[PDB]
Amino acid sequence: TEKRLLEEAERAHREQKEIIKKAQELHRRLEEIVRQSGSSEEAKKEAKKILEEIRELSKRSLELLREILYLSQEQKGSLVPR
């Protein structure tokens, strides 16, 4: 069969790595916000936006993870829905 199935899984992991990096940097910014100006309501608004962005990132990496399950474990199955 096609080994590309696992090469595509590799790509997904590489994309997850970039997603994780971004998420960690967003958490770093949240730390800066909370530590410094966490009492500021406008800073809270910034933090909220960041938290929402992180949520998106976690969804993206989760969807990729479910794709990994298919490509890696059960590529002969039908785990498309994820």
Binding site: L6, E7, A9, E10, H13, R14, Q16, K17, I20, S61, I68, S72
Partner: peptide, 13 residues
């Protein structure tokens, strides 16, 4: 999470 992805990534290789 990253480490888990890296572990399985090497498996894929």
């Amino acid at each position: 999470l990253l480490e888990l992805s890296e572990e399985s990534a090497q498996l894929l290789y």
